[PDB]
Write a protein that binds this DNA or RNA. Structure first.
Lengths: 139, 112, 51, 109
RNA sequence: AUACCACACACAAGGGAUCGUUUGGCUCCUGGGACGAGGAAGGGCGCAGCAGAGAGCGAUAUGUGUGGGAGCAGCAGCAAUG
RNA sequence: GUACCGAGUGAUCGGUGGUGGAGGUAGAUGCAGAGCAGAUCUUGGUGGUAGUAGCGAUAAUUUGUCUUCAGCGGCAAAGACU
RNA sequence: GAGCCUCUAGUGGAUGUUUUACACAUGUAAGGGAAUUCGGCAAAAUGGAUGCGUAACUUCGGGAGAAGUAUUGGUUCAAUUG
RNA sequence: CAGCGGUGUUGUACGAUAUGAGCUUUCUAUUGUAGUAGCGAGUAUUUGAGACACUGGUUGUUACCACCGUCGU
């Protein structure tokens, strides 16, 4: 086709003699308010107290090797939640108690952790602590 | 006497291209005062106008490659693009052979 | 070009002498009313047809 | 000039300041951005920057599609002759074997 | 409508209508109806103290004779020996 | 020619103040190339669109220095191309 | 005297800004492999030289580079065109 | 901008030294002895080397305290 392929071809009929608000057009994308309902708290803790599971007997903080990419190390209290969340690193968010309780079985189940990943987020991260890196390489 | 013209007349006098003429920087007044070919001849004598040397293009690799090909290096099946006959002409092989053989017979007969 | 006939050369010679402005003294003369010579030409804008 | 008429000697990270610039014109736009770096380092946007021919010649050494990673330069500050309401900064090339250990120095004369 | 757009009036721009003027045109009438081998009509090229076009003139390119008589339009020079 | 003011149902007519610098009417009759919004009318002059659309196929350009008086103009040193 | 690279000789300006979307010249792509479309249109794949091996039909000249397969750089040697 | 810590990407720098399928027999002193070599793809050591980035860790050095306008009391 001539005059471009990445477009809506037909934007209306002859009558009514105007464009309808329901047809797609080019413009702003992203930077909108959105609310995500019923996300579940897996863990709560502090950035400088080490922790362990019943199965992983290493003792480590939440901070990965070298920190989070454009942030560094967590120092205060933290929450951990399932799945992804709006916006990039460093943006402010508002938290609220759930508006109504959920009936779904996936939501209301218990959670028991056995491992948490603490490897580097830059490149392929292949160690969980500096002690392992020092032991893999010499000296 | 504009300086572009000084270069043209110098190029004529020194039998080279305009790209080889160097005008000395410290006496532009002395250059600009020139009127004639005989002025330019004097400036050339005094070294205020100079012919530069040619840019270098050495045959080092060409010679090296040539000697290697004389030893028989390169020249394998993955280095040739023309037919056997293009590289070593067949009519020439014939013509070289039969002239030698005929010359051999001629001398043997004539010497008895 | 460099090769010319005698007839072509005289046409060029005459066309070259006629191509001049009004001399600067004439402008001062009491009776004289011309501004510019309208018969002046440019090689970029007209052909002589000397061929 | 600067405090106590010293020259400042510094190193310019040409590799970093050109990270976004196109390969086809790297050396042409690098010159515009070397001058910009100087003016922000001495907080003097409206001032002139002057590049000595030896520094020009060092920068163009591998043609238009490249620029050196680091370059060491001596800087002098003077009032600008054509309009002495402005300053001019003059850049000179300093030849170094290695960059290890070289910080920012101020040298007398 | 602070500043945009429109209209009215005063001043400045932009264009050349109108009125005043005319060493040109047109029509009718009367006279005339005169070229060339003794080289015509028509074409070209030259000629000025400063001179392109046009006018005038032919290497004698403002000469001779007759009748008159005051200047040659600019600048430099000429003129009752015209 | 331009602002105002009066007369007439109306086609039009009259006066006043500035501008202009030499010609102009009222009555009765005569002769006509005798009245314009239009013709994708004819000629000349001017808008909105608009400081907008565009002005950049090709090898490529940087630094200093003099002019220029503000020309990537000239000259030195580099980097490229046919 | 192909394309690509250099010597002799010759060469260049509408300024700054990292510059969204849609374009125009181009690159690359998991698994699938013409399901796309009037239609494999466009693109991809094959490619030089050396050897082995080559069908129907034919006017016996051709078909024929049929098809199908293998080899290829650097170094150091023998042997003399294999 | 540099040190010194930390986290990555690529794959083992330059230069030396040793080895290398093979091919070769040169020189100085001097009568006869001693001295006495060249040419070579590559491979191993020094060397998880060298290069390059980012650090909300820590030390040193260097730069920065202005100015112009509008509305109000």
């Amino acid at each position: 086709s001539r005059k471009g392929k990445r477009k809506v071809a037909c934007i209306g009929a002859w009558h009514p003699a105007n464009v309808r608000r329901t047809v797609a057009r080019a413009g702003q994308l992203g930077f909108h308010r959105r609310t995500a309902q019923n996300k579940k708290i897996y863990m709560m803790g502090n950035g400088k107290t080490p922790f362990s599971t019943e199965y992983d007997l290493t003792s480590k903080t939440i901070n990965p090797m070298g920190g989070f990419l454009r942030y560094g190390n967590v120092k205060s209290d933290f929450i951990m939640v399932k799945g992804g969340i709006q916006g990039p690193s460093k943006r402010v968010l508002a938290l609220r108690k759930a508006f109504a309780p959920s009936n779904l079985g996936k939501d209301n189940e218990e959670i028991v952790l056995k491992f948490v990943d603490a490897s580097s987020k830059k490149g392929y991260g292949r160690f969980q602590t500096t002690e392992e890196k020092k032991a893999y390489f010499g000296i | 006497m504009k300086l572009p013209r000084v270069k043209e007349l110098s190029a004529d006098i020194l039998k080279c291209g305009v790209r080889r003429i160097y005008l000395d920087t410290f006496e532009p007044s002395k250059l600009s005062a020139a009127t004639s070919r005989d002025d330019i001849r004097k400036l050339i004598k005094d070294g205020l106008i100079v012919r530069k040397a040619q840019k270098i293009h050495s045959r080092y690799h060409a010679n090296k490659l040539m000697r290697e090909k004389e030893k028989g290096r390169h020249s394998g099946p993955g280095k040739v693009k023309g037919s056997k006959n293009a590289r070593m002409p067949e009519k020439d092989k014939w013509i070289k052979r039969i002239r030698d053989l005929r010359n051999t017979l001629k001398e043997l007969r004539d010497k008895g | 070009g460099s090769i010319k006939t005698r007839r072509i050369k005289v046409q060029l010679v005459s066309a070259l002498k006629k191509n001049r402005c009004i001399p600067q003294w004439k402008r001062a003369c009491p009776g004289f009313k011309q501004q510019y010579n309208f018969t002046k030409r440019s090689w970029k804008r007209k052909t002589l047809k000397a061929c | 000039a600067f405090k106590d008429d010293k020259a400042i000697e510094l190193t310019i990270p040409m590799g970093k300041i050109t990270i976004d610039v196109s390969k086809r014109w790297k050396c042409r736009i690098g010159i515009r951005r070397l001058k910009k770096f100087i003016t922000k380092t001495f907080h003097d946007k409206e001032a002139e920057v002057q590049i000595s021919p030896d520094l020009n010649k060092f920068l163009w050494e591998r043609g238009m599609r490249n620029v050196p990673k680091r370059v060491r330069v001596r800087v002098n500050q003077e009032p600008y002759p054509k309009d002495p309401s402005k300053k001019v900064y003059k850049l000179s090339h300093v030849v170094v074997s290695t960059f290890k250990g070289l910080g920012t120095e101020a040298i007398a004369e």
